[PDB]
Amino acid sequence: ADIQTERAYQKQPTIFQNKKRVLLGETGKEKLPRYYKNIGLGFKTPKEAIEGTYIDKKCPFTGNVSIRGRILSGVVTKMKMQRTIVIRRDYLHYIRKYNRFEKRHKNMSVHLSPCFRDVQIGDIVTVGECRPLSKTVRFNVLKVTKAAGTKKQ
Amino acid sequence: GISRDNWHKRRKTGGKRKPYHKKRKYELGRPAANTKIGPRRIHTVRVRGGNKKYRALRLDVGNFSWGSECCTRKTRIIDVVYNASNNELVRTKTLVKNCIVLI
Amino acid sequence: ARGPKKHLKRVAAPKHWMLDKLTSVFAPRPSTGPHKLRECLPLIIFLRNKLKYALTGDEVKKICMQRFIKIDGKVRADITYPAGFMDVISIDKTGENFRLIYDTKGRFAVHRITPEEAKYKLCKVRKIFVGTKGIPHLVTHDARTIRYPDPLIKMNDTIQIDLETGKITDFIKFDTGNLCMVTGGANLGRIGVITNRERHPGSFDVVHVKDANGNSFATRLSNIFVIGKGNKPWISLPRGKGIRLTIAEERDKRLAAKQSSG
Amino acid sequence: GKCRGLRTARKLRSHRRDQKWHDKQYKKAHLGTALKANPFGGASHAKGIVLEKVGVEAKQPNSAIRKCVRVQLIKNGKKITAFVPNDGCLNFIEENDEVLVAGFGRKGHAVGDIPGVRFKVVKVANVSLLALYKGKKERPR
Amino acid sequence: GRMHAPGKGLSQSALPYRRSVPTWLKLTSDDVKEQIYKLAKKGLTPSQIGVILRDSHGVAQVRFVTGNKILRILKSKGLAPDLPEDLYHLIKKAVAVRKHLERNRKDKDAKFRLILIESRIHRLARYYKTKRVLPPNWKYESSTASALVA
Amino acid sequence: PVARSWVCRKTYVTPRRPFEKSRLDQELKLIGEYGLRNKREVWRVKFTLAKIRKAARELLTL
Amino acid sequence: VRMNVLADALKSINNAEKRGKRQVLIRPCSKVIVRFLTVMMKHGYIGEFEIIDDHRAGKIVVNLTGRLNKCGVISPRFDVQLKDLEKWQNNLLPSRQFGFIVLTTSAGIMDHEEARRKHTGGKILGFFF
RNA sequence: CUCGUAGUUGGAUCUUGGGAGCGGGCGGGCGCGCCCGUCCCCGCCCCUUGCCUCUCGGCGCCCGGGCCCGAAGCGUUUACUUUGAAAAAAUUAGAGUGUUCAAAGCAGGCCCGAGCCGCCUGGAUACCGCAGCUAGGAAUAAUGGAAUAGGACCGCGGUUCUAU
RNA sequence: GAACGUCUGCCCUAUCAACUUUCGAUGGUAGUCGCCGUGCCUACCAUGGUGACCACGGGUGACGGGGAAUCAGGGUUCGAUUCCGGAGAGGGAGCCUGAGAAACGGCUACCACAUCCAAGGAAGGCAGCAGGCGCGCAAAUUACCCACUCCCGACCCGGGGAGG
Numbered sequence A: 001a002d003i004q005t006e007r008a009y010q011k012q013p014t015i016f017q018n019k020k021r022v023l024l025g026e027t028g029k030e031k032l033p034r035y036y037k038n039i040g041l042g043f044k045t046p047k048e049a050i051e052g053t054y055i056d057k058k059c060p061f062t063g064n065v066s067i068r069g070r071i072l073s074g075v076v077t078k079m080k081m082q083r084t085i086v087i088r089r090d091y092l093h094y095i096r097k098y099n100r101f102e103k104r105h106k107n108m109s110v111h112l113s114p115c116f117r118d119v120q121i122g123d124i125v126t127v128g129e130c131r132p133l134s135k136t137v138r139f140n141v142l143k144v145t146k147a148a149g150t151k152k153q
Numbered sequence B: 001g002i003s004r005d006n007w008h009k010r011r012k013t014g015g016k017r018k019p020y021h022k023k024r025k026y027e028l029g030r031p032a033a034n035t036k037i038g039p040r041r042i043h044t045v046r047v048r049g050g051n052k053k054y055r056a057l058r059l060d061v062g063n064f065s066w067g068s069e070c071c072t073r074k075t076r077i078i079d080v081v082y083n084a085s086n087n088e089l090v091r092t093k094t095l096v097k098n099c100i101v102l103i
Numbered sequence C: 001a002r003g004p005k006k007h008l009k010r011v012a013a014p015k016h017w018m019l020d021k022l023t024s025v026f027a028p029r030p031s032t033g034p035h036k037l038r039e040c041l042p043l044i045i046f047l048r049n050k051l052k053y054a055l056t057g058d059e060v061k062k063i064c065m066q067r068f069i070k071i072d073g074k075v076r077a078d079i080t081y082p083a084g085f086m087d088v089i090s091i092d093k094t095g096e097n098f099r100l101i102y103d104t105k106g107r108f109a110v111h112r113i114t115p116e117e118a119k120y121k122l123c124k125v126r127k128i129f130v131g132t133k134g135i136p137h138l139v140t141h142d143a144r145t146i147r148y149p150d151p152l153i154k155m156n157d158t159i160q161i162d163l164e165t166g167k168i169t170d171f172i173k174f175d176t177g178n179l180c181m182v183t184g185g186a187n188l189g190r191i192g193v194i195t196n197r198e199r200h201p202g203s204f205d206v207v208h209v210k211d212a213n214g215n216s217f218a219t220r221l222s223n224i225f226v227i228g229k230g231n232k233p234w235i236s237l238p239r240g241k242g243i244r245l246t247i248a249e250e251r252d253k254r255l256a257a258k259q260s261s262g
Numbered sequence D: 001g002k003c004r005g006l007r008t009a010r011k012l013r014s015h016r017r018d019q020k021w022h023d024k025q026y027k028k029a030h031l032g033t034a035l036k037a038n039p040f041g042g043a044s045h046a047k048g049i050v051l052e053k054v055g056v057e058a059k060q061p062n063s064a065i066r067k068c069v070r071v072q073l074i075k076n077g078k079k080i081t082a083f084v085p086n087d088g089c090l091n092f093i094e095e096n097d098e099v100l101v102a103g104f105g106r107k108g109h110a111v112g113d114i115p116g117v118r119f120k121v122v123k124v125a126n127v128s129l130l131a132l133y134k135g136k137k138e139r140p141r
Numbered sequence E: 001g002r003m004h005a006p007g008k009g010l011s012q013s014a015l016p017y018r019r020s021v022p023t024w025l026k027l028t029s030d031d032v033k034e035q036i037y038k039l040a041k042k043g044l045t046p047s048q049i050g051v052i053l054r055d056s057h058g059v060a061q062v063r064f065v066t067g068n069k070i071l072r073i074l075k076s077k078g079l080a081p082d083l084p085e086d087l088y089h090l091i092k093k094a095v096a097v098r099k100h101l102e103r104n105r106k107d108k109d110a111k112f113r114l115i116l117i118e119s120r121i122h123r124l125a126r127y128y129k130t131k132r133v134l135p136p137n138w139k140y141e142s143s144t145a146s147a148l149v150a
Numbered sequence F: 001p002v003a004r005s006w007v008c009r010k011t012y013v014t015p016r017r018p019f020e021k022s023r024l025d026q027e028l029k030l031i032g033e034y035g036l037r038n039k040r041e042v043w044r045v046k047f048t049l050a051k052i053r054k055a056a057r058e059l060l061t062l
Numbered sequence G: 001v002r003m004n005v006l007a008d009a010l011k012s013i014n015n016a017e018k019r020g021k022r023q024v025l026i027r028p029c030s031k032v033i034v035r036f037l038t039v040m041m042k043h044g045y046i047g048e049f050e051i052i053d054d055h056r057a058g059k060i061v062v063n064l065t066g067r068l069n070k071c072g073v074i075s076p077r078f079d080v081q082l083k084d085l086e087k088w089q090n091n092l093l094p095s096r097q098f099g100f101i102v103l104t105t106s107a108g109i110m111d112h113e114e115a116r117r118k119h120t121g122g123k124i125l126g127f128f129f
Numbered sequence H: 001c002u003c004g005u006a007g008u009u010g011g012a013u014c015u016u017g018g019g020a021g022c023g024g025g026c027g028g029g030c031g032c033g034c035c036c037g038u039c040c041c042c043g044c045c046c047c048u049u050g051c052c053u054c055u056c057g058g059c060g061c062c063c064g065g066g067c068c069c070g071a072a073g074c075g076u077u078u079a080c081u082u083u084g085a086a087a088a089a090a091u092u093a094g095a096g097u098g099u100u101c102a103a104a105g106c107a108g109g110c111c112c113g114a115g116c117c118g119c120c121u122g123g124a125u126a127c128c129g130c131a132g133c134u135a136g137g138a139a140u141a142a143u144g145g146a147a148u149a150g151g152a153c154c155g156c157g158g159u160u161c162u163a164u
Numbered sequence I: 001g002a003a004c005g006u007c008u009g010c011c012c013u014a015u016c017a018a019c020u021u022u023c024g025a026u027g028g029u030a031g032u033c034g035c036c037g038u039g040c041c042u043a044c045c046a047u048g049g050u051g052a053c054c055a056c057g058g059g060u061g062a063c064g065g066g067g068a069a070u071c072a073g074g075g076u077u078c079g080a081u082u083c084c085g086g087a088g089a090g091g092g093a094g095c096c097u098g099a100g101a102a103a104c105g106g107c108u109a110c111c112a113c114a115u116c117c118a119a120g121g122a123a124g125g126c127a128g129c130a131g132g133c134g135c136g137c138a139a140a141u142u143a144c145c146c147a148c149u150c151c152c153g154a155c156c157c158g159g160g161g162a163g164g
Helices: A047-051 C043-050 C062-066 C115-119 D009-020 D033-037 E029-041 E046-057 E070-077 E085-103 E111-131 F022-034 F040-060 G005-017 G031-043 G085-092 G112-118
Strands: A071-078 A084-094 A101-111 A124-129 A139-144 B041-046 B052-058 C089-091 C096-098 C121-124 C158-161 C192-198 C206-211 C216-220 C226-228 D047-057 D065-073 D079-083 D098-103 D119-124 G023-026 G049-052 G059-063 G071-073 G102-105 G108-111 G122-128
Touching: A084 A124, A101 A124, A101 A139, A101 D009, C192 C216, D047 D079, D065 D098, D065 D119, E029 E046, E029 E070, E046 E070, E085 E111, G005 G023, G005 G031, G005 G071, G005 G122, G031 G059, G031 G102, G031 G108, G031 G122, G085 G112, G085 G122, G102 G112, G108 G112
Parallel strands: D079 D119
Antiparallel strands: A071 A084, A071 A124, A084 A101, A124 A139, B041 B052, C089 C096, C121 C158, C192 C206, C206 C216, D047 D065, D047 D098, D065 D079, D098 D119, G023 G059, G049 G059, G071 G122, G102 G108, G102 G122
């Protein structure tokens, strides 16, 4: 998009787009490459990456992340906080002193690539772990499930 | 006297990760200045792991390549026409990553 | 921790060395190489209690200087070295040559070997990240960055060097139903055809084991160690026949052979 | 009320904690007041300095005048009252000498028929009364 | 159950266990659908549509004559109403209750019914919110008291 | 820090209600039948027997 | 709301039983309390019984017999980890010579002996005598 | 004394559904066969209750394919019961075990002048919460699907495409 | 080995109910930075993260995990205390050398001290073994060897108030 104007310049360096003088090899006529780091455990390159210029250095479908350690999921709750989302992994604690359970949940912080949009409240988002990104966001968004009414078309 | 610290920062909810230990040499924040163009001056610094790395003081020339033919020469940093974080590093003439120069 | 430690404890040491509770608190630690603390043998305690040559350690240190004992085809000046499973030691003053190999349970069973079989050691492949100069050169968990292996070996096989650092000989490849001896884990003494290998994405790979006596189970990938292709391992198995006879069964054989025939 | 669902612990355990806050066997050992106002800081012994020797009344049912000493604590400094056993054992006591008094045995409380007395003496001139009467030793009186 | 009323009596109905077709005057599905559409067309409520269909034609259950019922077939036609029965009847008695109170302010014990009125419409409003016959937010602070009232 | 041993156990198990003289009827008939030294042995035998019997029994139900 | 027709069965049967009526009629029912009825029959505490069909609740008539003492209902609904099974046996039901606590789990309905025999445990809901 | 947010909870029902089912494990007349035991309990099943559509092939089996497979179970989901990796040695529950009792200890014995340049094989399991991981299970709990119409045979593709 | 790292657990407390902030508390962007990840750090941007699911606030004789006295299964009291981690080096702060250090059995300040001395100046830090002194009811000895154990060197040729 009109994305090329962050406070540096960004592109893909694998196969050179300036290798032809006439403006047919540069961004120009035929779009430059955009390398997709080997993605897997069921994961691949959906619409977004191919259809657009959606690069991020901490993207899970691109960038220098490594989805390892554990693999989890959660629910979409609060859509503020540009480029970062907060998700509740509601579980119910279990006790042995008493033979009953307790309620306790941990809220999770994830960055979400400009790839994914039209995210709405109340669905599932699957998540992975990669290199520590910041104080809170230690995770990565992968899939979005439910963005429509509950029982109709 | 400068050294990096993470637990020094407030916690997620406005609390404070209180101290529990002594500030170590693992966490360094080594102080320096920014290398403009001038007389070539460098010093090695003895850092973590006994390894020693090269901190610049001043320098003029390096290795500038060309992409559309991929060929480097050794040219002069006369000036600095843009840096990508603040509006005054242009004039300050630092030497940083993705620094923009009219050379 | 501000810096590496130097004293290891009696009680902190692994229990597979007959840990003692009145002698002291400290420990004989090794020199930190391949076949690490959890899977090593202090050769000082080997000469001290394992064959009981010198009653106490004050004399155990002497055979190295006496230059009758050697370690891994090279002279020994340290009475100890990082050395564990499959370690050949050739005492050519009483003629006793040992492999340090695992018991029914993992006691470094007293194994006597023919030095002819001992010359060619079997070494597991750690990895080939890809060699320098466009030419690969493999690594072993006994720390052998071996140059020039055979140009078809995939990881988790075992190479066969002669205490040497050149090219190699007949090599195994990890596949179905080929003999194994665990390196650690709880499956020591359970040797059998693999028969199945869950190379399952999403976790650490697992190797099913159909025992030589019948019992079927599954082990983590890292635990299993290739010992023999086909239905024969070239590695000799000591008393216990490579099968841990059950504690329920061991009642008769710990008692009609110890304290009944001696 | 008396509810019995399963995941209820958010109600269950916290209400149970709050409703625990009524036993003496909870209060007397789970809030600072008990320790910080026990007549001493807590010790089976109470060494100190005798500051005077007097008699304490009894109630007329069991009429009596028992032998009790004001001890000046060393661990804090306050004054306490302790009876002395071993019939004949008040005349020995030379005051301004470091003495042992233990609480009267009733563990933070007192016996009836000598009210106010929650302490009792063993050492005087660093010499026990249980040795003074039995004669296996003697004070440096 | 039974909060909003202190009485517990029930006298609603217990349809003939025999789910068979009524068969007194059969009056089969054709004119039944015609009357159902007419009743809904002229501006009628299912609660009284059923009463009329039981009175003149005679029905114990519309599901018996035809599988789709009144609400179902109106919803397949396009004649969905403004607000449903339980919100609307309580609204149109609330209008009367509030008229009462603010004409006789001293009735301290009819504010106690007004309050259960915002409570009943509040319960059913946050119910029909999930039913999604009402928008995802539907606001009654007595600000919706007379928007539909001329 | 030390290198001495550390292990001890209890043998002369306490009487759980000695104030009736009837458990003492047992205790004095033990010396009336075998005349040994004190009642440490009484309690040691009653511990050993309980331990063996219970080692069998609590494993029985499984 | 009205709740737990299982509990209401275990209260209505014991309401009528100590009054001695030969059969009993209970307004509500479920397939699962039917299943308890069948587990009860396999031991023979109750006899055969009839399932009156009224789609509104489903009524049950069941004969009461001198083969019974009482059967309990446990809300909340626990789980027997197959460690605690012997514990529950020894602390709820009066006898190991009759009466056998009940479990709903991943191997069908069952009482605790047959549960232990198939080596699978689960929720406690019943225990009879 | 009423209302009401979280608050903990909750109607019925959406298979506990048939066969003579078979081999095998059983209560039982009979001598695991006939069978009574809602498929008494599962591998193979049969009315049903999920998948090879995809590569090379395993006794099949037909003529590179296909009824099942694989590396492997990829067409919702969770709760919760049965599998193993892990539960740092050790305090212990603790096997074998004369410390002359007892605790203590992982110990010793067997020999003959040793005279053989010796022998026995030991110096064991289990538990190690919750939660992280692994495979079964689908009874109970929740939740979930094609209501103004779309799940499927590339239905026939106008249209714009974009390689191998 | 050593930090950095993914999910998940702490004791009391509403006479703590709305907080965290330009002084980075919320993330992105760009740039320095140290071994990196990261407002570790500065600017321009979006003003955000959290809790009535107990946040924010607190307070704890807060050392913590394996475990001890008990104890029908329940639980109860704890666990400075030989294992391990994290810790501090009379209290902070600052640093060269070192593989590893913010090393006080390397120092430089400062703190409050006080060691001396013929006052021009200097120069010290037992929560190691002994101990003293003070406290307190309360815990051992200025005994030796490193003969067990270890642990150190340029290294069976020397070194140990580690341990005995």
